[PDB]
């Protein structure tokens, strides 16, 4: 496969490598707090881990969207692949077990630590878009 791809690419021909669990996502465990405060008691945001071929994301609201317009809070996560993937089989599951247990998490600047105590609800209006 590799020499065939080498020769095809030398010929300016369309060739591809088939990967099982491609290692396309650089490791990154990070969070974004769309609503926060110094005491970190009423937070709203997203947590995610992108490792290899695996993405886990979890949008959290501490208030459970009590004051949100129509009691809905919208979370969005965009992962920009560094290369174009084709004919990709993808398993989608409705829960991120990585962000489903109590955690003590550093702050953005590392000044302090905040507490996360998830109670998992079913995600609503799940739309997964693959864009080129």
Partner 1 sequence: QNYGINLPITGSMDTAYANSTQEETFLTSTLCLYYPTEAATEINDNSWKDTLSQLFLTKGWPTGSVYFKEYTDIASFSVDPQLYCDYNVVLMKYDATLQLDMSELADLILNEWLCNPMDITLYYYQQTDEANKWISMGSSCTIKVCPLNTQTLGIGCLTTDTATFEEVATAEKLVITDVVDGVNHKLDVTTATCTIRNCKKLGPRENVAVIQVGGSDVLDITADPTTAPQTERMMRINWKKWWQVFYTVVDYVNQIIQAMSKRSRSLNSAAFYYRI
Partner 2 sequence: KSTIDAAKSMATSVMKKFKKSGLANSVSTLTDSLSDAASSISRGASIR
SS (H, E, C) 15-42: CCCCCCCCCCEEEEEEEEEEECCCCCCC
Which of 107, 116, 118, 120 is in the footprint of Zn ion by CB under 5 A?
107
Which of 22, 24, 25, 36 is in the footprint of partner 1 by CB under 8 A?
36
75 binds partner 1 (CB under 8 A): no
CA–CA gap between residue 7 and residue 76 (Å, rounded) = 41
CA–CA gap between residue 42 and residue 102 (Å, rounded) = 16
Token pair in block for residue 70: 């129509």
126 binds partner 2 (CB under 8 A): no
Instruction: Give the binding range for partner 1 (CB under 8 A) out of 3-11, 12-20, 24-32, 51-59.
Output: 24-32
Positions in 42-101 near partner 2 (CB under 8 A): 69-70, 72, 74
Determine how many CB atoms are found less than 10 A away from the CB of residue 60. 20
Q: Which residue number, 72 or 93, has a Cβ lying nearer to partner 2?
A: 72
Token pair in block for residue 60: 């959290």
31 binds partner 1 (CB under 8 A): yes
Binding-site sequence positions for Zn(2+): 20
């Amino acid at each position: 496969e590799y020499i065939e791809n080498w020769n095809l690419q030398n010929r300016r021909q369309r060739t591809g490598f088939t990967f099982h669990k491609p290692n396309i996502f650089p490791y990154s465990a990070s969070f974004t707090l769309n609503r926060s405060q110094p005491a970190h008691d009423n937070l709203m945001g997203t947590m995610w881990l992108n490792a290899g071929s695996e993405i886990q994301v979890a949008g959290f609201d501490y208030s459970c969207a009590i004051n949100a317009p129509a009691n809905i809070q919208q979370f969005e996560h965009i992962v920009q692949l560094r290369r174009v993937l084709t004919t990709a089989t993808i398993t989608l599951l409705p829960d991120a077990e990585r962000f489903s247990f109590p955690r003590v998490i550093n702050s953005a600047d590392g000044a302090t630590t905040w507490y996360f105590n998830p109670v998992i609800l079913r995600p609503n209006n799940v739309e997964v878009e693959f864009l080129l």
